[PDB]
Symmetry: C2
Subunit: 127 residues, 2 copies
């Protein structure tokens, strides 16, 4: 049932930086056990751009073993950081509080030089 | 960078995997497109090769940066896993190249794992 609670709602998840992802799931019309991920992400990581306002997220979720991959392009009405982040990982519902474990890639430019930075985010569910 | 949006092109990686991207303007994000289309996997040693899987993601047109994902579930095979690619199009050379880093989340029995790699796709 933690699994179906996720599918029915808009759930919130806070990572170690204080940033917050809100996820909504819609069944795929062609892929079984698969959901289109929508929702928004608020970046609260110090030392970064594009903080404090929601950015849409998009991606896909596999309900069979609760694996997700989602992305944000850092462009909205408030700020544009000319970049995108992709997260891929898995939910763990085995503890008393649910956790989403992810690896991420941030593609961006520094002047004319492109780069892709790697990192890891652990999100803990908000109630 | 315009050829890319035009409609349908094939982007082929070092193993012969093929990404077929479709773009539609984002409802709320400036200079951004929703990405859809299909991915045909051919990565050596991997499951779910040789059939189209839908992909989804987002593309930033200002400097041609993309992030997209595939869940490995369709009517032909289910590998109970998902891959996310993030990277940038380099239109320097006579050959355009999409340079990406990817993560694959999967289970081995009861143990979850996330594997990393890199894929370079060339426009066919």
């Amino acid at each position: 049932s933690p699994d179906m609670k996720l599918l029915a709602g808009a759930s919130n998840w806070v990572n170690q930086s204080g940033s917050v992802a809100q996820f909504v799931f819609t069944p795929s019309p062609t892929q079984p056990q698969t959901y289109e991920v929508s929702g928004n992400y608020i970046n609260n990581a110090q030392g970064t751009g594009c903080k404090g306002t929601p950015y849409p997220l998009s991606g896909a979720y596999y309900s069979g073993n609760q694996i997700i991959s989602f992305s944000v392009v850092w462009s909205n009405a408030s700020a544009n950081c000319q970049s995108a982040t992709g997260w891929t990982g898995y939910f763990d519902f085995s503890g008393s509080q649910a956790v989403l474990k992810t690896d991420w890639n941030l593609a961006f430019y520094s002047g004319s030089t492109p780069a892709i930075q790697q990192g890891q985010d652990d999100f803990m569910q908000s109630v």
